[PDB]
Amino acid sequence: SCDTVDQGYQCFSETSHLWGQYAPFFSLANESVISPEVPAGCRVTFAQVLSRHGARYPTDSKGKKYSALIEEIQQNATTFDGKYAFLKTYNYSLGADDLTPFGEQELVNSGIKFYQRYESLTRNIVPFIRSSGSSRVIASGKKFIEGFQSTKLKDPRAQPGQSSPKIDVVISEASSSNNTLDPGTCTVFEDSELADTVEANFTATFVPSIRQRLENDLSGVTLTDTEVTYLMDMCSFDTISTTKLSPFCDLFTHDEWINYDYLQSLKKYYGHGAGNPLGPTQGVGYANELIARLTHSPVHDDTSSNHTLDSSPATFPLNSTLYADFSHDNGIISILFALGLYNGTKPLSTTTVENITQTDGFSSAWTVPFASRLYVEMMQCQAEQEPLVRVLVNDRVVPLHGCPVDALGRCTRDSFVRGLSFARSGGDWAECFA
């Protein structure tokens, strides 16, 4: 009743919305200055959705650490009173790596919403779909298809006998694979430790106090700063693993969650966003593929794209009207920056928390929550002659940069494409090997 198709996850909002990329999707439609609705007198002529996979269990690697830390606390602590009582008998039973049942539901809902928003197109066009080769992503693609098709069957104006969508291309995640959705071939970038340095710097500003409180309340226990953040991570996973808030959430105050949320934004920003010298460069391949689709022209890219894969209509159609791509948070972050969407955002302070007003709408929770979605739509309106482009990120209309935006956040397709000079030139891909 609080996780809906339109609004997303609204349960425990004062806490759940502060989990960064471990936060379930929640609609930012009400936070948008510009109305998300398709303008009266306009008709959508192109729509592409780039979606992240749904909510998942911890990765096997982290699950080990979480489990170990909990058994260790259960052994070393002499007293478990008050809000720590649950810990005495907590039994770690989370799965690993896979999409959770809640995560599956998130994608089904996303499919329903995409179908309804673009009904005039979705009623008789089958979207061309691609997914990065990771089980949780592939499963997310399939759930989205379920939701999308289920809504189409109930539509009286839908075209009878049309085929169902399916995953047309699965891009390998092998280290030697050219994958525009989540590049792994930029050698120098892959070796970068910038995010680790930043994570260390910031946690130092607020975790130590928390650590002291926990060490003091659970006598016999010693914790490193990192382990405390594992306990905060558990609040998220232990809550959405299934109605009730995880007891792990109760161990931290609200201002600590504000800090945690900010820590997640830093990791993404300096790891794959503009904070990293080669961050935005990871998204140019995808951006050039987008330019190809908007203009119905072959791809001109020499970065992350697979030349063979993009040379043929079978694996890269230029005239489908609807497209859907499924990926990871990291690739999406880089793509968002390569599209120039956060050009009005100054480098995030590494010592002090900055609110969403200061960061001009950027945060991990606002850009890459679980099941996040980015829509790129093109429309033709009565007054204008050229088609207009608009981008919504998790339902917030994000004003475009590099082109003359109108009152509704749109740019003509041509000036928009013209504005992506960084991507069209190949970003700083050269720096990947030198």
386-390 long-range Cβ contacts below 8 angstroms, 24+ apart: 386/412, 386/413, 386/414, 387/45, 387/46, 387/412, 387/413, 388/42, 388/412, 388/413, 389/294, 389/413, 389/416
At 198, the amino acid letter reads V
Q: Which neighbouring-strand residues pair with 4? A: 8
Question: Which residue numbers belong to the known binding site?
Answer: 21-22, 52-53, 56, 59, 136, 182, 268, 328-329
Nearest to 381 by CA among 412, 350, 403: 412
Q: Pull the structure tokens for residue 131.
A: 């997914």
Residues with a known catalytic role: 53
Q: Yes or no: say if 400 and 409 are a contact pair by the CB < 8 Å rule.
A: yes
Q: How far apart are CA 133 and CA 174, in angstroms?
A: 9
Side-chain-side CA neighbours of 371 within 13 Å: the count stands at 32
Contact residues for 64 (Cβ-Cβ < 8 A; gap 6+): none
Contact residues for 407 (Cβ-Cβ < 8 A; gap 6+): 34
Q: Yes or no: say if 91 and 126 are a contact pair by the CB < 8 Å rule.
A: no
Q: Yes or no: say if 120 and 377 are a contact pair by the CB < 8 Å rule.
A: no
Domain with residues 46-432, CATH architecture: 3-Layer(aba) Sandwich (3.40)
Contact residues for 68 (Cβ-Cβ < 8 A; gap 6+): none
Q: How far apart are CA 377 and CA 416, in angstroms?
A: 12
Contact residues for 191 (Cβ-Cβ < 8 A; gap 6+): none
Nearest to 125 by CA among 94, 154, 165, 87: 165
Q: How far apart are CA 228 and CA 222, in angstroms?
A: 10
The 3-class secondary structure across the chain, one letter per residue, is: CCEECCCEECCCHHHHCCCHHHCECECCHHHCCCCCCCCCCEEEEEEEEEEECCCECCCHHHHHHHHHHHHHHHHHCCCCCHHHHHHHHCCCCCCCCCECHHHHHHHHHHHHHHHHHCHHHHCCCCCEEEEECCHHHHHHHHHHHHHHHHHHHCCCCCCCCCCCCCEEEEECCCCCCCCCCCCCCCHHHHHCCHHHHHHHHHHHCCHHHHHHHHHHHCCCCCCCHHHHHHHHHHHHHHHHCCCCCCHHHHHCCHHHHHHHHHHHHHHHHHHCCCCCCCCHHHHHHHHHHHHHHHHCCCCCCCCCCCHHHHCCCCCCCCCCCEEEEEECHHHHHHHHHHCCCCCCCCCCCCCCCCCCCCCCCCCHHHHCCECCEEEEEEEEECCCCCCEEEEEECCEECCCCCCCCCCCCCEEHHHHHHHCHHHHCCCCHHHHCC
Q: How far apart are CA 146 and CA 368, in angstroms?
A: 22
Contact residues for 53 (Cβ-Cβ < 8 A; gap 6+): 99, 103, 107, 134, 136, 137, 139, 140, 326, 327, 328, 370, 371
Nearest to 244 by CA among 4, 25, 5, 15: 15
Nearest to 23 by CA among 102, 113, 129, 137: 102
Nearest to 267 by CA among 140, 364, 142, 386: 364
Polymer length of the chain: 434
The 3-class secondary structure across 162-225, one letter per residue, is: CCCCCEEEEECCCCCCCCCCCCCCCHHHHHCCHHHHHHHHHHHCCHHHHHHHHHHHCCCCCCCH
Domain boundaries of the chain, sorted by first residue = 46-432
Q: How far apart are CA 127 and CA 48, in angstroms?
A: 9
- What is each CA distance from 425 to 294, 330, 421, 422, in whole angstroms? 18, 22, 6, 5
Q: How far apart are CA 347 and CA 282, in angstroms?
A: 18
Helix axes 254-271, 194-204, angle to 10 degrees: 160
Q: Yes or no: say if 102 and 369 are a contact pair by the CB < 8 Å rule.
A: no
Q: Pull the structure tokens for residue 331.
A: 């690739």
Q: How far apart are CA 259 and CA 265, in angstroms?
A: 10
Side-chain-side CA neighbours of 84 within 13 Å: the count stands at 17
At 145, the amino acid letter reads I
Question: Which residue numbers belong to the known binding site for 1D-myo-inositol hexakisphosphate?
Answer: 21-22, 52-53, 56, 59, 136, 182, 268, 328-329
Q: Pull the structure tokens for residue 279.
A: 């961050």
Q: What is the largest CA-CA distance in the chain?
A: 74
Q: Yes or no: say if 225 and 263 are a contact pair by the CB < 8 Å rule.
A: no
First to last CA, the chain: 53
Q: Pull the structure tokens for residue 381.
A: 């309106």
The experimental resolution of this structure, in angstroms, equals: 2.5
Q: How far apart are CA 166 and CA 144, in angstroms?
A: 10
- Phi, psi for 269 (deg, rounded to 5): -65, -45
Q: Which neighbouring-strand residues pair with 296? A: none
- What is each CA distance from 328 to 54, 179, 325, 398, in whole angstroms? 10, 12, 10, 21
Q: Pull the structure tokens for residue 241.
A: 């693993």
Angle at 187 between CA 183 and CA 193, to 5 degrees: 95
Contact residues for 52 (Cβ-Cβ < 8 A; gap 6+): 140, 326, 327, 328, 329, 332, 368, 369, 370, 371, 372, 373
Side-chain-side CA neighbours of 16 within 13 Å: the count stands at 21
Rg of the chain over Cα atoms, rounded to whole angstroms, equals 22
Contact residues for 424 (Cβ-Cβ < 8 A; gap 6+): 288, 291, 300, 417
